[PDB]
């Protein structure tokens, strides 16, 4: 059978600087959640199975499939992680319920789970609807298991990079082993006459223009990321190197958009050049092209104990 409310309680959502990451935004690995959990054998068997909901959290930052519940040495469940990722605006946990050489009534105890949030990204439905999930500064994170509801605050630091500018963004989608990658044209005050938007990938690269958003959004939020998407007037070419978006007429208000997914051959290597042209209304074409490397620090199933790489 399906049990609810074995979790029962948010302890702690705490960020953890480290030298790649810089300040605590809600992308920005890693955050660590420590839940609370309690079973008791006379509602709970095993093999039973119970759910964690994690709203608005993207993915899980660790190369385990699964994460033990575990007190003084025993485990008494495994929950195997399932990232929302671009499918779904959340994230959760599947559990089932362990067989102990303990005899308990009841037990209690604490999980740790390593997460980055969703506040946007692409123009998708899903990055879309997490686009509002967060504000500035302080927040109530809640998470849920069947109709339990477990909260905590947390402060979430506003991007440093200004939006007046052009924005760019990369995430990877580990389940898919892709990154989605992002360009917003820079502000016009009054709308656009024209403009090109876009990128060129280089360095084992290459677009994927099976999974591509191009949009108009009203305005950007905390973070910089589109949160609504219209159609408008543009033409666009995809190729596998690039990704060309010519847009005409867009009113104030607005700011045009484009991102795609990624394959890299080094999924923590490549190199985009923008073409970042645009013509504000009643303005001169400005043409800014540049080029960005990212760099990536994911892992591949490391893990942790007994799996070890050959030189």
Same mark, same amino acid.
């Given at each position: 059978?399906? +049990?609810?409310?074995?979790?029962?309680?948010?302890?702690?959502?705490?960020?953890?600087?480290?030298?790649?990451?810089?300040?605590?935004?809600?992308?920005?690995?890693?955050?660590?959640?420590?839940?609370?959990? #309690?079973?008791?054998? *006379? *509602?709970?068997?095993?093999?039973?199975?119970?759910?964690?909901?994690?709203?608005?959290?993207?993915?899980?930052?660790?190369?385990?499939? &699964?994460?033990?519940?575990?007190?003084?040495?025993?485990?008494?469940?495994?929950?195997?992680?399932?990232?929302?990722?671009?499918?779904? *605006?959340?994230?959760?946990?599947?559990?089932?319920?362990?067989?102990?050489?303990?005899?308990?009534?009841?037990?209690?105890?604490?999980?740790?789970?390593? +997460?980055? !949030?969703?506040?946007?990204?692409?123009?998708?439905?899903?990055?879309?609807?997490?686009?509002?999930?967060?504000?500035?500064?302080?927040?109530?994170?809640?998470?849920?298991?069947?109709?339990?509801?477990?909260?905590?605050?947390?402060?979430?630091?506003?991007?440093?990079?200004?939006? &007046?500018?052009?924005?760019?963004?990369?995430?990877?989608?580990?389940?898919?082993?892709?990154?989605?990658?992002? !360009?917003?044209?820079?502000?016009?005050? $009054?709308?656009?006459? #024209?403009?090109?938007?876009?990128?060129?990938?280089?360095?084992?690269?290459? +677009?994927?223009?099976?999974?591509?958003?191009?949009?108009?959004?009203?305005?950007?939020?905390?973070?910089?990321?589109?949160?609504?998407?219209?159609?408008?007037?543009?033409?666009?070419?995809?190729?596998?190197?690039?990704?060309?978006?010519?847009?005409?007429?867009?009113?104030?208000?607005?700011?045009?958009?484009?991102?795609?997914?990624?394959?890299?051959? $080094?999924?923590?290597?490549?190199?985009?050049?923008?073409?970042?042209?645009?013509?504000?209304?009643?303005?001169?074409?400005?043409?800014?092209? !540049?080029?960005?490397?990212?760099?990536?620090?994911?892992?591949?199933?490391?893990?942790?104990?007994?799996?070890?790489?050959?030189?």
């Amino acid at each position: 059978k399906t +049990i609810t409310g074995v979790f029962n309680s948010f302890d702690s959502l705490t960020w953890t600087r480290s030298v790649e990451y810089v300040y605590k935004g809600p992308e920005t690995p890693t955050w660590n959640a420590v839940l609370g959990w #309690s079973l008791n054998s *006379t *509602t709970a068997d095993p093999g039973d199975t119970f759910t964690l909901i994690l709203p608005c959290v993207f993915k899980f930052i660790t190369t385990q499939t &699964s994460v033990d519940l575990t007190a003084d040495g025993v485990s008494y469940a495994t929950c195997d992680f399932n990232a929302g990722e671009e499918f779904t *605006t959340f994230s959760s946990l599947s559990c089932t319920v362990n067989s102990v050489s303990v005899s308990y009534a009841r037990v209690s105890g604490t999980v740790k789970l390593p +997460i980055t !949030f969703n506040v946007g990204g692409t123009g998708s439905s899903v990055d879309l609807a997490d686009s509002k999930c967060f504000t500035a500064g302080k927040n109530t994170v809640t998470f849920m298991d069947g109709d339990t509801k477990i909260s905590t605050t947390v402060d979430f630091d506003a991007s440093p990079v200004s939006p &007046s500018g052009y924005i760019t963004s990369s995430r990877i989608i580990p389940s898919l082993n892709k990154l989605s990658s992002l !360009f917003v044209v820079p502000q016009c005050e $009054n709308g656009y006459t #024209s403009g090109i938007m876009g990128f060129v990938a280089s360095n084992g690269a290459t +677009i994927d223009c099976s999974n591509v958003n191009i949009g108009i959004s009203k305005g950007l939020n905390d973070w910089n990321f589109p949160v609504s998407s219209e159609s408008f007037s543009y033409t666009k070419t995809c190729t596998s190197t690039s990704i060309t978006v010519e847009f005409q007429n867009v009113p104030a208000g607005y700011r045009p958009f484009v991102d795609a997914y990624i394959s890299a051959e $080094n999924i923590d290597k490549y190199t985009l050049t923008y073409a970042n042209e645009y013509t504000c209304e009643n303005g001169n074409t400005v043409v800014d092209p !540049f080029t960005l490397t990212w760099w990536g620090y994911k892992n591949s199933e490391a893990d942790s104990d007994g799996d070890v790489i050959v030189v």
